[PDB]
Each structure stands twice: as structure tokens, then as C-alpha cells.
């Protein structure tokens, strides 16, 4: 599973044709506007010099959200710098990330990897944020078996689990499930950091991250999580184009290495009603000339610059439009209903559990360790469309120069304001003056910086989030202006996306449940 | 599975008798007018010099469509240049393609490999197309088990599948089917390019194309297809006589390597009513002195010569007669009824899904990359009879010098005409003048070539295709004149073929279905 | 199950409201263009004087072939003279035959019982055939259980039988099937007249015809037939409007009295490929002033009048158009393929098994015992549409005055001509002069009647029958002129009927069989 790097399309063709490497098959990897993973296999002896400049013939009339009235034939453009070898049955396979194009070589408007290549090369052209470093924290469940059906008279679910105490299905029928005892099972919401007797799948995780560190997708940490059979991988920080490339490769490596142990692995938001969901924490930071944009080398603003709160409020202003892309499934709004360890309100806070963006108080003096943790997104959607919408929303927060919001740390229901933000940041609407009981970190004889401490912040009430797709798709219809800058997201791209999801809601509401018989009979 | 080449019948007898090669058995391979695969085994120590000039004794009174009133004894004529070694149980077996002859050595009129040797050596004798290069794209299903019956009271089907979500049979009875979960199954019409968790048979495909590349049947590409457990192999371009030889060897290698994994592989057109079928895309091109017949090194005709549209219209004129041979099964007309991704009309278009012949818009400037993609045929029939009927139909399009048809690209139901064909190609019947809204590929200040742009094309309505065998066999009865040139297909050959298929339709219509009880009871 | 008769709509309302009869529910019976049996239940205490002149509210937007763009509300017109009482759970139910009408009271053009009321009152208005007496001979199978399915992977049939030796299903699973021994079972094609050990359902038949003779539907004869579990009821001769009324009541009484014995009864043409089918022999005769139209009280023409052969040749001329109505199912053309005891040719003969119409040689001197036995029809279609098309075809044979055909009795393949038809009936085309070896019934010193023996008959070759629906529906499209006389069958009636059946053929040919896997794999 060793990873190989290249600089020009010619270094592929010399590496492929060399007989020492034993490379037999060259595979290509494509992605949808939805999150899917397509793959076609090409043989080495037939690849020529011409088929790398030109692309491979491909019919995309059957791939969802990839059809043009009369463009029935597309290309597959081989892109270098994202490759890794494999050993499948004693045969070596390159795996190359590959975009899809039109006949002339024009950028297809429904390719998500061509969107991230455009929005990153758009931001770099303004002298702001030549690099975007994004980290991720994947959360997945590992079930044993899953059976469902959709017949009108026989619909069912059966989730078979090995660690959960509350699954009372029997695994003796499953043809390695040797002894079924409830003594070594994890009870509900009580398995945060668990070990060998209770963590049934510890050998799988060392074989996943062996296969990821060999590929230079370096892994920062690992634990079990607050659910029965829910795990966690937190990766190293990467460039924003190679992050979304490494997220597709991670999800397929997690899926295949689990299924070689005869189990399943899922990335749904909210399976299992009475347990937690699966999120994506996107730790974002911008860089200019190997220096953080988010750092001013001063206190009372926590060493931040206004150029950082402009990036946060650009997200909080457009967050109901980002929810169309970030969580765009009917499952994901079953992740927000309860509100326990969930985002209810749309603001940024240091330690409020109901905040969407959370700022880091670990190593506040260190410039490298500065980030913005966006917690709304799911792994269900395509990672190129999500990370391009966040940058295009956050970039419209810097050019617009509107006022950011107060951090609003709320002990109970009482929203407080920190001691560093009590000093001169809101001239009008002094309403939280009763709520200022804070001492913060240790600071004595503080200095009030004059140009950073102007009104700059607005004290409004923090708004809510959309709790369904019919609220989020209508927020995208009235708020799609920050995405259409330099024609990155076209107008037809967004209309064909909202038309697809509104077919999925209508086919979802026709289906008669088993809660309909319990409730209304 | 290494392949060996020979030049004269004597180099067989020296290679067979040499003790270094350990060749123990010599096997022969025969083929029917239908697509079958016959094989007889001969031992090396008994083969002499005389038994290669003469043939082997063979009784063909029991092989279907291979009986003569009183010729009860035939020959088997060993033909060189199509051999490959094997390793079956530590024993080396030659496998030689072998024709069948009469006592004198005359060409038997019901041998399909002797028909392709005649129609290729007929075309080469007119100074036109010394070589015919044909490529193929095989599509096959891989089921797990299949049970059927034909008792009057107990007829059934049971197709057992491992990837399809909609097969709700249980595989626990089958005595490697370990865990049956619906989580790793492919839903319908949604598995175009799939991977390891969902593509259940990926190890089979690397073992097929290992066995094909060792035999110098080189494989261009591989993918899953738009059905649950339907795959695809696209091969290299070969000479037309060695293509149909390599198609029989491929179908038997696919069948045996799948069945050594305890599965079945089929080449039916339309198993499984609610999924796709299996086709043969025949990419055809002709060559003269290592130069394409289909290339004139000019634009507005897409670099084509009239000698190419003569070959296309020779097929479209005789396409209902070719359907007797190309798809001649009662299953194959269940592949045309729906019309979704199906050929409804009989014309040639660049990007119309309902066209029979599709021309390639990838690399239009390259002369090597020029072809004609005929999409009507199935793998059910014998590949020597199909590829000989296409050449004999397309050759009658060049000698006849009739006018070809307009390309007729149809956005919806509105048939348009390209900008390159709008300029001066039809003097009378200007009916599509309302439908000319096209811009094509990029071309500014175009040049109208005078001798190529005469009336040359006729604007008629594109006709339909036959949708049953009773329409196609009657089109063969009134249209068998292009096949009887130089007595290649004899008159008795076609009469005995239509008499065989009309026995198969009558025995098919007697059989009382299970749709008869649902519908009429 | 006693039958009651009435003369005016008022005698219903006095019989219903009288307390001696205990009539609690009044049921209505409607019929489709297809053969169906609809029934709605009305209570006596709510029926008033006004609801018998007006009709009952009925929605026919869901009944097949009974919908008008905007007529969503119809009537149900109660028709007297077709009633019978019942005893269901100690409650007395009238059962009245009831037509459907429009709002004004106009004759709905898609009601089959209103068509027979029109074509019988059309024939009676020309002084020809004031009465039409038609008899019938029903043939039905009695199976025990039948299971089928249409899933793409699991289609099956299972016909469970108790008398057939060749059904090798076991009836021990069926929860009165006590001992399963092959000793008391009927072998194939060998059960014509069978008895108590072998005829498993003899008690059912005495309970059917007890329920039919109580209703004054008098039964002429009963036997087993030439198949395992195939029976026969031949009824008394009735008026043509009350015959088709009594056929619907018979088929429902046969279906319910069999199903109260926990069995099934069917009227399909050809279930069970290797056994016989189910027909309708329609013995037809016309009457004028209690005298047979078909009788002239002379010999050499068998006591027939030209007015009879005009009625036969009116059927034989239009027989491919009658097949659209008489047998209009995809099953029924599985009843003609074999040709054994089947109609191959389209002529009328005294003792030819392959004749469509067979004339009676029993009691040729008796005038009452004269009839025409049409053997083409099935019980699948609606009996009002079939018997109206036969009269309208046979009436166009009398007004047209064209020549009838020769009777053409054929010993083997040699068509002979009787001694009575050898004498002077065809002046030109003397071709059967070699085939006249006949002696007939006993007749010496015969008399040649001069005005009846003119050329009168034509010697053409007897044509064939259509063997599929695509031949019969196209014969109806070019031959629908004899039905449109006095606007009985409207033009929109026939177009909407052919459009319905051509949807049924297309949905039938998509379905992939189990004979497709046996034959083409």
C-alpha cells in the first residue's frame, strides 16, 4: 500500500512502463455531486502516450447527477499527485484520482473535484490564503450485519451488533460470534474510552491505520466513542484539495478492511435512534507565506485578527445555505432534534456545547495551533462540494467587511460575554450588562488595544439552524449568491441539485412506517 | 496458458513430437451455425504425418445444423495459427481451432469458420480492405445459482444472486455465502462503477484477464455495469478472422474460470426483466496498405470519405436481414421492447441513444482512431456468422453506390442536422429547415468542399427495426441477395437456417406461462 | 335458489316491500367489455319508488374499459326478468341483472348488455329472425390449489391436482386429501367418461346442477372430458339475451360451489400444456313465427334453405374479425397451435375435425333439431360481446347475398364433396372432380331441385384462421364494417378496445420466461 508521487504526466508513463515495478493495472477514481466512489480498471500494455493527454472513454448516462441531454460520451482526465499502489492477488494496481471533462477539455460544471480546483485557485489569486489547511475527524459505526426490506406488507430492520447490550437479536444463526454473553457488552452511552474485553474490534483499527500510514495519510489519534460500536479516526492536517481526496480514500479503506473481517462499517448520520450520530469536525486554518492569517501576536482578542472573525461570521451568515450541502440527507436532521450534545444555536463559542463553531483554548499562545472547528457537516455528502462551499462562504465574509457577532458563552440559558470582549466592543444595545460575571484565563493589568476594540462586534440574538431539508433547500434558493462568484457554481448546477433532492423528499414521505401503525390505529 | 504460433502444418508436427514441451494431448475446437463449442481430445503418440494433411474421423449426425442426408462421416481439418497451451492436472494440452470438411476437401457450406475464411478472402481480392480490424466489448452476468424446470404443473425459475438487493432468496441452503446482509448489496440500475464492498466478484476478473493476457488476447478495459452483477470486458482490435476465434475462446475461459469459483456466467440477452441486457459493440474499421479506408484528411465531413458512409448505409439498408443472424433468439427481442437505452430507429448518429450505429467524436483528427460502432448484435449467436454477414452487407454498400442517409441527431423527438451537414448535402425535400439549431465542435470560417458536398445524402425518414423473429426471418427471405455473392452463403444454407428457427418459435409458443395464469384467470 | 319472474318495474317494488318474502338485500350485477362480474348490495328499507326509474349512484372510474374523460358518475339501471333469490346466512337476496347508463338515459356505448339488447332488437325489426335460440356447452377444470409468482428472480407455477397422474406435487402439506395413491388417478388424455373411483369430484357436479335447475337454467347433460379434471355442462336452449345472462350466472355459480369444497374452478383456454383446452360450442338457430329459418322441407340440400348457408358464410367471411372478440387472450392461441382436435381451416363440414362450423347429422328430418355449431369461442371473453358479434356477422351474410362455400368434407388431406353437392352446384373451376368418392346417407333415385342447385356455391380453397392476436386485431382494423351497422358498435368503441389489447401484448412480451433459460443459455 505504498504511496508514490509524481510531478508531470510523463513521469506516470515512465513509471508505468518500467518492468521493475510490476504495475499491471491502472485504476481511475471518479466522484459525484453526491458522495460516491466510482472506479474503472485499465491495463498497462494498451495505455499509450496519447491516452494520457486525451482521456478515457466513459459513458455517464447512468451515473446520478452526471447526465447532459446529448453529451452521452465524456472523458476521464488522469490527474497526477494522488496515487498509491496496491497488492490485490499478487498484482500491483495504481489508483489515480481522475476528473471528468467534456470533449474540448472544458471544466465540467457537475464535477466536484473540478470545483475544489477552481475555488482554491480563486482564493490564491487574491493574495489571501495561498494555502488552506483543513483537518478532519471521521466517526463510523461497525455493525455485524444489517437486514432491511421495503415490501408493503413486510418492511423491517434488523441491525445485528456484538458490543451493544441493548441489541437482543441472537447471533447463533449467523454462519467469530463464538459465545454470546451479555457480560462483555457495552451499555448505552457508556463506552467512551473502552478496551479489549469490551471493544470487540480493536484488531480492525490497527489494520486500518497500518494501511493509512503506509499511504502517508498520517493518523493523529484513535478512540472508541460515546455509543456502542462507534469509533473515531482523526487525521493529520493537509491541503484542502488533498484533504477531500484523502477522505474518499479513507472511507473506502475503512469499508473494505472492515468487510474483510465479515462486518459492515457505516457513515450514516444517526443510525440507532437512542445513540449518537456521526459528524465531521473540520478544523480550518489559512496560511500566507508560511504564516497564519489567523494570528496577530497580541492579547484581549486571544491573539486573533479581525481577519479571522470575518471568516467565522461569513459561515454563520450563510449557514442555512451550507446545510443544503453539508448535511443534505433526511437522516441528518434526526441528528439535531434531541439537542443533547447537539448544535441548537448559530454562533461561535469557546466552551458552549450548543455552538456550531468552537474555538480552541489549548495553546492559545502558539501560532501554528490556531483553528476553527466547524461541527455541522456529515460524511454523507461529497467532501469536495462541502469544503468548497465553506471556503466560498468564508471568503465572502472577508470581502464584505460586515461586523462579526459576539462570542456569547452561555453558562445555562444565560449568555455571558467574556472579560476580553466586555471591554469596548459594542457601543449600542447594552443588554447583556447584567450578564458579565466572568474571569477567563489569568490576566492582570490588561491592555485595551484601540483600533481592534471599536464597535466591531454586533450584539444581536444568535439565530437558529434549519432542522429539515425543506428549510435548507429554500435557504439555498434565496441565498446562492456567494457561490456564483466567478461562475464556480453555475446557476444550472444549483437548480439541478435542488430538483434532485426535492424528488428524494417526495419519495420519502410516501412510505408508510411502523410508527404510523403504533401511533394512528 | 501461454500462446504458441506456427507458420506451416509441419511446424505443428515438430513441436508436438519434441520432448522438451511435454505436450501430451492435442485438442480440436469446432463451432456450429449456432454458437456452440465442441471439443475432442487426441493423443500425441498416435498422431502421424498423414493425419494432419488428412483429417480426423468425426460423426456429425448428432450435432445441430450439421447433418447431410448421407454424409454421415466428416473430417476435422487442423488449422494452424490459433493455438494455446494449457496445464490441466499437470498435463500440457494444445488447443487448436479446426474446421470441418467433406471427403474431397471441399468447403462445407454449414461451417461458419469456413465462411469467414471465404468472405475475408473475397474482400481482399478486389483491392479494397486487405485487412478488417474489428474490436469487441463483451458483457456478461455472474449469478450464483440458477434452477428451472418445465413440468406442466411445476415450472419455476430461481436465480440466486449475491450482489442484487432485489433477490430475496436465501443463500443459507447453498452448501463463500458466509453472512447474508443487505447492507453490502447493489440496488437496481445503480451499480455502474462499483468497488470492493459491493462488487462481490473482483478476484474473478483479475483471474480472467490474467488468463487472457497470457494468451495474447490483450484486454483494453474492465468495469462493472448498469445492473446488479453485470460486468464488461473490452478487448484489443484484431483481424476479423482471429477476432471471432478469440471470442469463442474468451467465452469459454469466462465460463470455466467463473465456474471454478462455484458460480455461473451467462451471455443471454435479457435475463432479469427489470435489468439491462448483454450486447456486443462491434467497432469496425477497414485498412488498405496500413492506411484507413475511413479517412480523407479533410473537415466538414469529419475527416471521413464517402467510402465510409457507403459502408454504414450498406448496414442500415440490410439491417432487418442482419437481425436474423445478429440477434436470433426469442430472448433478444425482450432487449428492444422498453426502448430505454435501446435502439428504436435505424440510422447513424454521433450522440443519439436510439441509434444503431454510433460514430466516435473522441480524437476526430486521429486517423487510427476512426471506427463504426454497430450496437445491434448479441453474444448468443455464432460470431463467425455474424461478422461475415456484416462485412457482406457493408461490402454491398460500396459497390452499389447508392446515397447514404443524413446523420439525424435528435435532441428530443426533433431530429436536427449538424452544421457540417447543413451545407449543401440535400437539394430536394428541405423539410428539416426549421430544425438546424446546432453549433457543433469549434469551427470558424469553414470551407465547403465542392465534390464531397453534392446531394449525396438523402433525407428520408429513418425506418424502424424488427422487434420479433417472425419479422426478421421474413426480411431474410426477401432479402438474401447480398449474402449469395460468389456463393458464400448458399441458398440451401439459408433455407435450412430459417427452417430451424421456425421450429424454435413454434415450440416456444406452446408453452403455458405463469403470466398466463396471472392475466387470464 | 328459486327463480322469480316479473313483467313491469312496479312488480319489483311490490314484491320487495311485501313482508312474506323476507327479502332483505337487493343486489345488482354489471358486466364489462371484458368478462367480469361486478356486484353491489342495496338494502330494502331505503329503496323507494323513485330509485327504480332513476338508477343507483355508481363510480366507474376504476372499472377497466368503463371510463369517460369527465363522466365520473354513472347510473345503474335495474332491468326486470332476470332475477333469482338466495339464502346467504339466513337472509334472502334478490340478484338482478342491471345495465349502466349515462345521465340522460342514453345507451352507454361500452356496455355489453346494452349491445345485445340493440342487435337483437335490430334483427327483429327486419321481419327476419324474431327469436334467436342459442345453446352452450361449458367446459371447466377443477384444480385443488394454484400458486404463482412474478418476481424477477422467483417466478413459478404450482398446479396441485387430485385426479391427474402426472402431477407429482405432494398434497400432504395442504391443511379431503387423506391418502395420496396413484392407483385411483386418471392418466393423460384417457379420462373421457369416468366414474366414482377416478372422478374425484362427482358430488360437486350434482350440487351445481341442483342449484341451476332450481333457477330454471335447465341442464341437458353432464360428463367428464378428455383431460384429467376437466368437466362439461351442456345447457338448454334459450333466447340470445337470456343466454348471455345465464352464462354469467352459471360461471359464478360454478366458481362458488367449487370453492365451498375448497377447490378452484377455471375457464382458461389451455391451462396445462399437455392437455386439452376449454371451448364454447354455440349451437345457433333462428326462428320466425315458431318456424325454423333453417328448414325448407326438401332433400339434396339436407332440408336446408339458402338462407342458412348465407348465415354460415357470413361467419366464415368475417371469422378473423370475430376472433378479436371470440378468443381475445394470449392463452387462446395456445389452443390452436397443435392442431390435434383443433380447427386448422375455415370452412363448414359434417364430420371434419378441422372445421370451424359443424353441421348436425343427427335427426336431419326433424325441423326443431337443426343448428349451427360454431366452435371457435372461449369462455374467457364477455358473452354479450361475443354473441352480438356473431349475429351481426351472420346477418351481413344474408343481406349481402354472396355465394356460400362448398362443405368440403376431407377424409385425409383430400377434400371430397358430397353426393348431394356433386350435382350441379359449381359450374366453373371443376378441380375436385377426381375427389368425389362418396355415398352419403341412404338415398336412391334422387331428385335434383332446379332453383336451389344453381352455381350458388363457390369452389375456392378454404382459408386459414389467425393464430395470434396481432393477426386478429389487424383483421378487426380492416374489417369492422359489419359491426358498425346502425351504430351498434361505435368507431370509438372498437378503437378503445384494440388500444387496450395492444397494451396487454406489450406487457406480456417483456416478461422473461423459464423457457428462455432452457433454450438460450
Automatic annotation (TrEMBL), chains A, B, C:
Biological processes per GO annotation: glutamine biosynthetic process
UniProt KW Membrane keyword: no
GO molecular function: ATP binding; glutamine synthetase activity
Keyword Magnesium listed: yes
Pfam families reported in the protein's UniProt record: Gln-synt_C, Gln-synt_N
The protein's required cofactors: Mg(2+)
Record keywords: ATP-binding, Ligase, Magnesium, Nucleotide-binding
Family under the similarity heading: Belongs to the glutamine synthetase family.
PANTHER family per UniProt: GAMMA-GLUTAMYLPUTRESCINE SYNTHETASE (PTHR43785), GLUTAMINE SYNTHETASE (PTHR43785:SF14)
Designated name of the protein: Glutamine synthetase
Top-level taxonomy: Eukaryota, Sar, Alveolata, Apicomplexa, Aconoidasida
Amino acid at each position: 500500500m505504498k504511496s508514490v508521487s509524481f510531478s508531470n504526466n510523463a513521469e506516470l508513463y515512465e513509471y508505468i512502463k518500467d518492468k521493475k515495478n510490476d504495475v499491471e493495472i491502472v485504476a481511475c477514481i471518479i466522484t459525484n455531486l453526491l458522495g460516491t466512489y466510482f472506479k474503472c480498471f485499465f491495463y498497462v500494455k494498451e495505455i499509450t502516450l496519447n491516452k494520457l493527454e486525451s482521456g478515457f472513454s466513459f459513458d455517464a448516462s447512468s451515473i446520478k447527477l452526471c447526465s447532459d441531454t446529448e453529451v452521452s460520451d465524456f472523458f476521464i482526465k488522469v490527474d497526477h499527485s494522488t496515487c498509491y499502489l496496491e497488492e490485490c492477488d499478487g498484482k500491483n494496481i495504481l489508483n489515480i484520482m481522475c476528473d471528468i471533462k467534456r470533449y474540448n477539455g472544458f471544466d465540467y460544471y457537475k464535477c466536484p473535484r473540478t470545483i475544489l480546483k477552481k475555488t482554491c485557485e480563486f482564493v490564491k489569486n487574491e493574495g489571501i490564503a495561498d494555502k488552506v489547511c483543513i483537518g478532519n475527524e471521521l466517526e463510523f459505526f461497525i455493525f455485524d450485519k444489517v437486514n432491511y426490506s421495503l415490501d408493503e406488507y413486510n418492511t423491517y430492520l434488523k441491525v445485528y451488533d456484538r458490543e451493544s447490550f441493548s441489541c437482543k437479536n441472537d447471533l447463533s444463526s449467523i454462519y467469530e460470534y463464538l459465545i454470546n454473553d451479555d457480560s462483555k457488552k457495552v451499555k448505552k452511552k457508556s463506552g467512551y474510552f473502552t478496551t479489549d474485553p469490551y471493544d470487540t474490534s480493536n484488531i480492525i483499527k490497527l489494520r486500518i491505520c497500518r494501511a493509512l500510514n503506509d499511504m502517508n495519510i498520517n493518523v493523529q489519534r484513535y478512540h472508541h466513542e460515546v455509543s456502542t460500536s462507534q469509533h473515531e479516526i482523526s487525521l493529520k492536517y493537509f491541503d484542502a484539495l488533498t484533504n477531500a481526496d484523502f477522505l474518499l480514500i479513507t472511507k473506502q479503506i475503512i469499508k473494505t478492511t472492515v468487510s474483510s473481517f465479515n462486518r459492515t462499517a457505516t457513515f450514516m448520520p444517526k443510525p440507532l435512534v437512542n445513540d449518537n450520530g456521526n459528524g465531521l469536525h473540520c478544523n480550518i486554518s489559512l496560511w500566507k507565506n508560511n504564516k497564519n492569517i489567523f494570528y496577530h501576536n497580541d492579547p484581549s482578542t486571544f491573539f486573533l485578527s479581525k481577519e479571522s472573525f470575518y471568516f467565522m461570521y461569513g459561515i454563520v451568515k450563510h449557514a442555512k445555505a451550507l446545510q443544503a450541502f453539508c448535511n443534505a440527507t433526511m437522516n441528518s436532521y434526526k441528528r439535531l432534534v434531541p439537542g443533547f450534545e447537539t448544535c441548537q444555536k448559530l454562533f461561535y463559542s469557546f466552551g458552549s456545547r450548543s455552538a456550531v463553531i468552537r474555538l480552541s483554548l489549548i495553546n492559545y499562545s502558539n501560532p501554528s495551533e490556531k483553528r476553527i472547528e466547524f461541527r455541522l457537516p456529515d460524511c454523507a455528502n461529497s467532501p469536495h462540494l462541502v469544503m468548497a462551499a465553506i471556503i466560498l462562504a468564508g471568503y465572502d465574509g472577508i470581502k464584505s467587511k460586515e461586523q462579526p457577532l459576539v462570542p456569547f458563552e452561555s453558562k445555562d440559558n444565560h449568555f455571558y460575554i467574556s472579560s476580553i470582549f466586555s471591554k469596548y466592543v459594542q457601543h449600542p444595545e447594552n443588554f447583556n450588562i447584567l450578564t458579565h460575571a466572568l474571569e477567563g484565563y489569568e490576566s492582570l493589568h490588561t491592555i485595551n488595544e484601540s483600533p481592534e476594540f471599536k464597535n466591531f462586534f454586533k450584539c444581536e440574538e444568535p439565530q437558529g439552524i434549519s432542522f429539515s431539508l425543506v428549510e435548507s433547500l429554500d435557504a439555498l434558493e434565496k441565498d446562492h449568491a456567494f457561490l456564483t462568484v466567478n461562475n464556480i457554481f453555475t446557476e444550472e448546477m444549483i437548480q439541478e441539485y435542488i430538483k434532485f433532492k426535492r424528488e428524494e423528499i417526495d419519495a420519502y414521505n410516501k412510505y408508510v412506517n411502523a410508527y404510523d401503525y403504533h401511533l394512528y390505529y
